[PDB]
Scaffold this active site. Structure first.
Site, PDB file in Angstrom:
ATOM      1  N   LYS A 272      36.376   4.435 -60.737  1.00 13.82           N
ATOM      2  CA  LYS A 272      35.380   5.271 -60.071  1.00 13.82           C
ATOM      3  C   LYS A 272      36.107   5.679 -58.785  1.00 13.82           C
ATOM      4  O   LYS A 272      37.309   5.442 -58.653  1.00 13.82           O
ATOM      5  CB  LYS A 272      34.109   4.514 -59.718  1.00 13.82           C
ATOM      6  N   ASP A 275      34.381   4.521 -51.862  1.00 14.51           N
ATOM      7  CA  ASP A 275      33.111   4.775 -51.177  1.00 14.51           C
ATOM      8  C   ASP A 275      32.948   3.754 -50.048  1.00 14.51           C
ATOM      9  O   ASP A 275      32.993   2.528 -50.282  1.00 14.51           O
ATOM     10  CB  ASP A 275      31.934   4.691 -52.129  1.00 14.51           C
ATOM     11  N   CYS A 277      30.550   2.386 -48.446  1.00 16.33           N
ATOM     12  CA  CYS A 277      29.604   1.274 -48.442  1.00 16.33           C
ATOM     13  C   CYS A 277      30.228   0.046 -49.138  1.00 16.33           C
ATOM     14  O   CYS A 277      29.875  -1.112 -48.889  1.00 16.33           O
ATOM     15  CB  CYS A 277      28.294   1.686 -49.103  1.00 16.33           C
ATOM     16  N   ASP A 337      24.471   8.720 -43.059  1.00 15.65           N
ATOM     17  CA  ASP A 337      23.201   8.031 -43.196  1.00 15.65           C
ATOM     18  C   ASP A 337      23.360   6.600 -42.703  1.00 15.65           C
ATOM     19  O   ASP A 337      24.459   6.076 -42.564  1.00 15.65           O
ATOM     20  CB  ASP A 337      22.711   8.073 -44.634  1.00 15.65           C
ATOM     21  N   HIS A 340      25.329   3.879 -45.086  1.00 12.56           N
ATOM     22  CA  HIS A 340      26.777   3.852 -44.991  1.00 12.56           C
ATOM     23  C   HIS A 340      27.193   3.428 -43.570  1.00 12.56           C
ATOM     24  O   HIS A 340      28.261   2.834 -43.361  1.00 12.56           O
ATOM     25  CB  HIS A 340      27.342   5.220 -45.330  1.00 12.56           C
TER      26      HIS A 340
HETATM   27  N1  FTI Z   1      21.224   5.197 -47.134  1.00 15.91           N
HETATM   28  C1  FTI Z   1      21.267   5.560 -48.227  1.00 15.91           C
HETATM   29  C2  FTI Z   1      21.118   6.019 -49.586  1.00 15.91           C
HETATM   30  C3  FTI Z   1      20.422   5.305 -50.564  1.00 15.91           C
HETATM   31  C4  FTI Z   1      19.824   4.000 -50.283  1.00 15.91           C
HETATM   32  C5  FTI Z   1      18.521   3.982 -49.616  1.00 15.91           C
HETATM   33  C6  FTI Z   1      17.956   2.694 -49.351  1.00 15.91           C
HETATM   34  C7  FTI Z   1      18.612   1.459 -49.700  1.00 15.91           C
HETATM   35  C8  FTI Z   1      19.828   1.493 -50.346  1.00 15.91           C
HETATM   36  C9  FTI Z   1      20.467   0.273 -50.688  1.00 15.91           C
HETATM   37  C10 FTI Z   1      21.698   0.337 -51.370  1.00 15.91           C
HETATM   38  C11 FTI Z   1      22.322   1.612 -51.683  1.00 15.91           C
HETATM   39  C12 FTI Z   1      21.721   2.835 -51.340  1.00 15.91           C
HETATM   40  C13 FTI Z   1      20.449   2.801 -50.644  1.00 15.91           C
HETATM   41  C14 FTI Z   1      20.309   5.784 -51.995  1.00 15.91           C
HETATM   42  N2  FTI Z   1      21.373   6.713 -52.394  1.00 15.91           N
HETATM   43  C15 FTI Z   1      21.528   6.853 -53.748  1.00 15.91           C
HETATM   44  O1  FTI Z   1      20.580   6.723 -54.538  1.00 15.91           O
HETATM   45  C16 FTI Z   1      22.946   7.237 -54.379  1.00 15.91           C
HETATM   46  C17 FTI Z   1      24.062   6.218 -54.163  1.00 15.91           C
HETATM   47  C18 FTI Z   1      25.174   6.423 -53.412  1.00 15.91           C
HETATM   48  N3  FTI Z   1      26.034   5.223 -53.477  1.00 15.91           N
HETATM   49  C19 FTI Z   1      25.379   4.363 -54.267  1.00 15.91           C
HETATM   50  N4  FTI Z   1      24.202   4.843 -54.738  1.00 15.91           N
HETATM   51  C20 FTI Z   1      23.329   4.203 -55.736  1.00 15.91           C
HETATM   52  C21 FTI Z   1      22.278   3.269 -55.286  1.00 15.91           C
HETATM   53  C22 FTI Z   1      20.942   3.702 -55.227  1.00 15.91           C
HETATM   54  C23 FTI Z   1      19.892   2.798 -54.854  1.00 15.91           C
HETATM   55  C24 FTI Z   1      20.235   1.438 -54.542  1.00 15.91           C
HETATM   56  C25 FTI Z   1      19.220   0.512 -54.127  1.00 15.91           C
HETATM   57  N5  FTI Z   1      18.397  -0.199 -53.739  1.00 15.91           N
HETATM   58  C26 FTI Z   1      21.589   1.019 -54.625  1.00 15.91           C
HETATM   59  C27 FTI Z   1      22.603   1.958 -54.985  1.00 15.91           C
HETATM   60  C28 FTI Z   1      22.108   7.577 -51.362  1.00 15.91           C
HETATM   61  C29 FTI Z   1      21.799   7.292 -49.899  1.00 15.91           C
HETATM   62  C1  HFP Z   2      21.050  -6.396 -51.814  1.00 24.68           C
HETATM   63  C2  HFP Z   2      21.143  -5.054 -52.540  1.00 24.68           C
HETATM   64  C3  HFP Z   2      19.859  -4.231 -52.685  1.00 24.68           C
HETATM   65  C4  HFP Z   2      22.343  -4.617 -53.013  1.00 24.68           C
HETATM   66  C5  HFP Z   2      22.520  -3.282 -53.698  1.00 24.68           C
HETATM   67  C6  HFP Z   2      23.950  -3.112 -54.072  1.00 24.68           C
HETATM   68  C7  HFP Z   2      24.219  -1.756 -54.700  1.00 24.68           C
HETATM   69  C8  HFP Z   2      24.936  -0.728 -53.863  1.00 24.68           C
HETATM   70  C9  HFP Z   2      23.866  -1.500 -56.007  1.00 24.68           C
HETATM   71  C10 HFP Z   2      24.148  -0.154 -56.661  1.00 24.68           C
HETATM   72  C11 HFP Z   2      23.134   0.164 -57.812  1.00 24.68           C
HETATM   73  C12 HFP Z   2      23.732   1.129 -58.819  1.00 24.68           C
HETATM   74  C13 HFP Z   2      23.679   0.760 -60.268  1.00 24.68           C
HETATM   75  C14 HFP Z   2      24.290   2.290 -58.417  1.00 24.68           C
HETATM   76  C15 HFP Z   2      24.927   3.324 -59.362  1.00 24.68           C
HETATM   77  O1  HFP Z   2      23.985   4.402 -59.555  1.00 24.68           O
HETATM   78  P1  HFP Z   2      26.489   3.995 -58.611  1.00 24.68           P
HETATM   79  O2  HFP Z   2      27.636   2.969 -58.925  1.00 24.68           O
HETATM   80  O3  HFP Z   2      26.710   5.294 -59.173  1.00 24.68           O
HETATM   81  O4  HFP Z   2      26.300   4.087 -57.086  1.00 24.68           O
HETATM   82 ZN    ZN Z   3      28.296   4.515 -50.892  1.00 29.65          ZN
END
Ligand code: FTI
Ligand code: HFP
Ligand code: ZN
EC number: 2.5.1.58
Lengths: 401, 312
Positions: A272, A275, A277, A337, A340
Site C-alpha cells: 500500500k 501514510d 498516521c 486534520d 494525522h
Molecule cells: N481525522 C481523520 C479522518 C478519519 C477519522 C475520524 C475519526 C477517528 C479516526 C480514527 C482512526 C482513523 C481515522 C479516523 C476517517 N478518515 C477515513 O475514513 C479514511 C482513512 C484515511 N486513513 C485511514 N482511513 C480509514 C479509517 C477510517 C475510520 C477509522 C476509525 N475509527 C480508522 C481508519 C479520514 C480522516
Molecule cells: C484504536 C483505534 C480506533 C485504532 C484504529 C486503527 C486504524 C487506523 C484502523 C484502520 C481501519 C481500516 C480497515 C482502514 C482501511 O479502510 P485503509 O487501510 O484503507 O485506511
Molecule cells: Zn492516514
C-alpha cells in the site's frame, strides 16, 4: 540527511517492468516525495528541518474551541477531536487552561451514557471508540475532576454488555466486531481499574487468531495484516500481559517490512502507500515489541534504538507531513486534520525517544526545539498521565459484584 | 420522499407535516469545545432527529428522516441504530432496504456502519445471494477495500460459499499480482478448503508462487506468501529450496531473495546441519549486506538478526 543523500536514490521502486495499479501509484508518491527531498538543492538554501510548533499550536488551539461545517462528518467522533487536539498540545508541551480543561470535562460528561461509556457527542449511544478517546482525554487532563467524570461502575456494565462468547467485544450495542474493540476495552478498563477476573476471558485467544500468514494482525481472524489493527492487537495483549500469545518473531519481520525504504515513513499494509498516521500505528509496535522480547530475556536487543530507522521516519514527517498553515497530514497533497496531526506527532515522539530500563537515547532531527514530550506506546498518552491515572483509580476497588 | 439535494427542498421546520413536533436542539453545554458550526440544513434535520428519537417515535416519517440524517453524516451510528429499530417495528421490506444500503455503500465504501448494517440485513434475511456480486463490484472500484474483503470472508465463511472463490482470486491476481488483499484471500481460501498439507496442493502453490516471483522479483507479496506457506513446516525440510532460490541470485535478485535465504539458513540452524559454521558465516554476511548495503532502512532489525544468530 539520510534521505537527501545520493545513494538513497537507489531505494527507488523496482517495477520489474511489470507495472500494475500498485506500481503506478507507488511510483507516483515516490516522485512527489522526491520533489520534497530535492526541495533544497533546487532552491540553494541549507536544509533546516523544523517543527512549525507555533503554527501547529494555533491550529490545534482553535479546533479545541470550534470547527467549520467541514467537520460535520466527525459529528459522532467528538471525544476523538478532544483527544487528538489535547494530545497534540500535550506533545507540543503546550498549555491546557484550567478553564478549557473543565469545559472539556463538562462536555465529555454530556457525551457519557447513563448505561456507561461514551457517545460521539451529547446524546449519542455509547461506543468503544469514543469511550477510549474520552478516557484518554480525561487522563491527559488528569485532575480529580476529570477522573471523576468517568463512571467506573457503569463502565464495567457497559464493557460486559459488549463482550462476546468467543472473546471479542462489539464496538457498540448492535454494532460490529474487530480488534479495535479489544484494545479499546483493555485500555479504558485497565486505566480505570475495573478489570475483573473474567472480563477479558478468552480475549487474548481471539486477538491471537487475528494474526495471519504475514506475521501481522488483521481486523478479525482471516483478514489481511493491517497496521492499525496490529497496534490494537499487540497493545491489547501487552495490557493483558499476553504478548506471548503471538509469534513475535514474524510479527517483528512484518512490522519492520512496513517502513518504506525510499520514503522513510510506514505503510499500513504490504504493498500500500505510506501514510503519516502509521508513523504511530506501525512504528509504535517496536517499543511494544522491545518490552515483549526483552521480557522473555532477549540478548540481541539494542540499548539505544528501536528496531526501525528512527532517522528516516523523522525526516519523512518533518519534511513531508507538515502543513505550512499548521497541522500535519497523510502525505504531500493530502489535507490536514487533527487525526494525522495527533498521529504524525505521536510517531515523531516515538522516533525521537528510546528507552530500555535505564537507557535513554533520544534522537532529535533538526532544530533541537523539534523534540516532543514523550508518549506511552500502549495508551498513546504521556507516560506520566498513564502512571498518574492508573494509580489514582488503583485506590478504588474494582467494581466487584 | 424529498431529496436533501432537490432544488425545492424545504427545512423540516418549514414543513406542514412536521409542526406537531418541537425540534430538540443539541446541548453542547454553556461552554462548548470542539464545537461544529453546522449548516442550517444539517442542524435542522438533526434537531428533528433528537426529537423523534427522544420521543422514540417509531413512525414512517421518522424513518424517512433517518435517511436524511444518514446522508448528512453516514458515520452517525446512533441514527443507524434507530433506523434498524424502525426496520423491525414498522416491518419494512428489507430487500428494498438492501438496495438502499447497496447504493450508500457505493458512496461510502469505507464507512464502518454501512457495511455492518448490510451484514445485519443479510443475517435477518438469511440471504447471501447478492453478496459476492455486490462485493466484486466494490472491489472493482477499489481492489483493496478492507471492509469489502472482510465482509466477503464473512459471507463465504458463514454461508459456506467457497467453490468459486479461488477462481476469483486468480482473476484478481491476474489484474494486479501485487494485490496483497488477494494473496491473503488465496490463503484464506486454500487453508479453509483443502489446506497446504496436501503435497500436490503445496507443490502447486510453491510452483505458482515461484513463478510470480520469477516474473516480478521485487513484488513483496509473493515472497511473503511463499514464505508463509512453507515456514509453517520448516523451510529446511525443503532441500531443493535453497538451490532454486540461489539460482535466482543474479537473474531475479532483490533484498527479498537475500532475506529469504537468511530465513532458510536460520532454520537449517535451528535444526542443526553439517557445515553449520559456514552456514552461519554466509547468513551473517547476508545480514550485513542487507544491513549495510542491500536494505538499510531496517539496519536496526538486520543487525539484530545478526546478533540473535550469534546466541542461537
Ligand atoms: N481525522 C481523520 C479522518 C478519519 C477519522 C475520524 C475519526 C477517528 C479516526 C480514527 C482512526 C482513523 C481515522 C479516523 C476517517 N478518515 C477515513 O475514513 C479514511 C482513512 C484515511 N486513513 C485511514 N482511513 C480509514 C479509517 C477510517 C475510520 C477509522 C476509525 N475509527 C480508522 C481508519 C479520514 C480522516
Ligand atoms: C484504536 C483505534 C480506533 C485504532 C484504529 C486503527 C486504524 C487506523 C484502523 C484502520 C481501519 C481500516 C480497515 C482502514 C482501511 O479502510 P485503509 O487501510 O484503507 O485506511
Ligand atoms: Zn492516514
Amino acid at each position: 540527511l539520510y534521505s537527501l543523500r545520493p545513494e538513497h536514490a537507489r531505494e527507488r521502486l523496482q517495477d520489474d517492468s511489470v507495472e500494475t495499479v500498485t506500481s503506478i501509484e507507488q511510483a507516483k508518491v515516490e516522485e512527489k516525495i522526491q520533489e520534497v527531498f530535492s526541495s533544497y538543492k533546487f532552491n540553494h538554501l541549507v536544509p533546516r528541518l523544523v517543527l512549525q510548533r507555533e503554527k501547529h499550536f494555533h491550529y490545534l488551539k482553535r479546533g479545541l474551541r470550534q470547527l467549520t461545517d467541514a467537520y460535520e462528518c466527525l459529528d459522532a467522533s467528538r471525544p476523538w477531536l478532544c483527544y487528538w487536539i489535547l494530545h497534540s498540545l500535550e506533545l507540543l508541551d503546550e498549555p491546557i487552561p484550567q478553564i478549557v480543561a473543565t469545559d472539556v470535562c463538562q462536555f465529555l460528561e454530556l457525551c457519557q451514557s447513563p448505561d456507561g461509556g461514551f457517545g460521539g457527542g451529547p446524546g449519542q449511544y455509547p461506543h468503544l471508540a469514543p469511550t477510549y478517546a474520552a478516557v484518554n482525554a480525561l487522563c491527559i487532563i488528569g485532575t480529580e475532576e476529570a477522573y471523576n467524570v468517568i463512571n467506573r461502575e457503569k463502565l464495567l456494565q457497559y464493557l460486559y454488555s459488549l463482550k462476546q462468547p468467543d472473546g471479542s467485544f462489539l464496538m457498540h450495542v448492535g454494532g460490529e466486531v474487530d480488534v479495535r474493540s479489544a484494545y479499546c476495552a483493555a485500555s479504558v478498563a485497565s486505566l480505570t481499574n475495573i478489570i475483573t477476573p473474567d472480563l477479558f476471558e478468552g480475549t487474548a485467544e481471539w486477538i491471537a487468531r487475528c494474526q495471519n500468514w504475514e506475521g501481522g494482525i488483521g481486523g478479525v481472524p482471516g483478514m489481511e495484516a493491517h497496521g492499525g489493527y496490529t497496534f490494537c492487537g499487540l497493545a491489547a495483549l501487552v495490557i493483558l500481559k499476553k504478548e506471548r500469545s503471538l509469534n513475535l518473531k514474524s510479527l517483528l519481520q512484518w512490522v519492520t517490512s512496513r517502513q518504506m525504504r525510499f520514503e522513510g515513513g510506514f505503510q499500513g499494509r504490504c504493498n500500500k502507500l505510506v501514510d503519516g498516521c502509521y508513523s504511530f500505528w506501525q512504528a509504535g509496535l517496536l517499543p511494544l515489541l522491545h518490552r515483549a522480547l526483552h521480557a522473555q530475556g532477549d540478548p540481541a536487543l539494542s540499548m539505544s534504538h528501536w528496531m526501525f530507522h528512527q532517522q528516516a521516519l523523522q525526516e519523512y514527517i518533518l519534511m513531508c507531513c507538515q502543513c505550512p498553515a499548521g497541522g500535519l497530514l497523510d502525505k504531500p497533497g493530502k489535507s490536514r486534520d487533527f487525526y494525522h496531526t495527533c498521529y504524525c506527532l505521536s510517531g515523531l515522539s516515538i522516533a525521537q525517544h528510546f528507552g530500555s530500563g535505564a537507557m535513554l537515547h533520544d534522537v532529535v532531527m533538526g532544530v533541537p526545539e523539534n523534540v516532543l514530550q514523550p508518549t506511552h506506546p500502549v495508551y498513546n498518552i504521556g507516560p506520566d498521565k498513564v502512571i498518574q491515572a492508573t494509580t489514582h483509580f488503583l485506590q478504588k476497588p474494582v467494581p466487584g459484584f | 420522499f424529498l431529496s436533501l439535494d432537490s432544488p425545492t427542498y424545504v427545512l423540516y421546520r418549514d414543513r406542514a407535516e412536521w409542526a406537531d413536533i418541537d425540534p430538540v436542539p443539541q446541548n453542547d453545554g454553556p461552554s462548548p469545545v470542539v464545537q461544529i458550526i453546522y449548516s442550517e440544513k444539517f442542524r435542522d434535520v438533526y434537531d428533528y432527529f433528537r426529537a423523534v428519537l427522544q420521543r422514540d417515535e417509531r413512525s414512517e416519517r421518522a424513518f424517512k428522516l433517518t435517511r436524511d440524517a444518514i446522508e448528512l453524516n453516514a458515520a452517525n451510528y446512533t441514527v443507524w441504530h434507530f433506523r434498524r429499530v424502525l426496520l423491525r417495528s414498522l416491518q419494512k421490506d428489507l430487500q428494498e432496504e438492501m438496495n438502499y444500503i447497496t447504493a450508500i455503500i457505493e458512496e461510502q465504501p469505507k464507512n464502518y456502519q454501512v457495511w455492518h448494517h448490510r451484514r445485519v440485513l443479510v443475517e435477518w434475511l438469511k440471504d447471501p445471494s447478492q453478496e459476492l456480486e455486490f462485493i466484486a463490484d466494490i472491489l472493482n472500484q477499489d481492489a483493496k477495500n478492507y471492509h469489502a474483503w472482510q465482509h466477503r470472508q464473512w459471507v463465504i465463511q458463514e454461508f459456506r460459499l467457497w467453490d468459486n472463490e479461488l477462481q476469483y482470486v486468480d482473476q484478481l491476481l491476474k489484474e494486479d499480482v501485487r494485490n496483497n488483499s488477494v494473496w491473503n484471500q488465496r490463503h484464506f481460501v486454500i487453508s479453509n478448503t483443502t489446506g497446504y498439507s496436501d503435497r500436490a496442493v503445496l507443490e502447486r502453490e510453491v510452483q505458482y508462487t515461484l513463478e510470480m516471483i520469477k516474473l516480478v522479483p521485487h513484488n513483496e507479496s509473493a515472497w511473503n506468501y511463499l514464505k508463509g506457506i512453507l515456514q509453517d513446516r520448516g523451510l529446511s525440510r525443503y532441500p531443493n529450496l535453497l538451490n532454486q532460490l540461489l539460482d535466482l541470485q543474479p537473474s531475479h535478485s532483490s533484498p527479498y531473495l537475500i532475506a529469504f535465504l537468511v530465513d532458510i539458513y536460520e532454520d537449517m540452524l535451528e535444526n542443526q546441519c553439517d557445515n553449520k559454521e559456514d552456514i552461519l558465516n554466509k547468513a551473517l554476511e547476508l545480514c550485513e549486506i542487507l544491513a549495510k548495503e542491500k536494505d538499510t532502512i531496517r539496519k536496526e532489525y538486520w543487525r539484530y538478526i545478526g546478533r540473535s544468530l550469534q546466541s542461537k
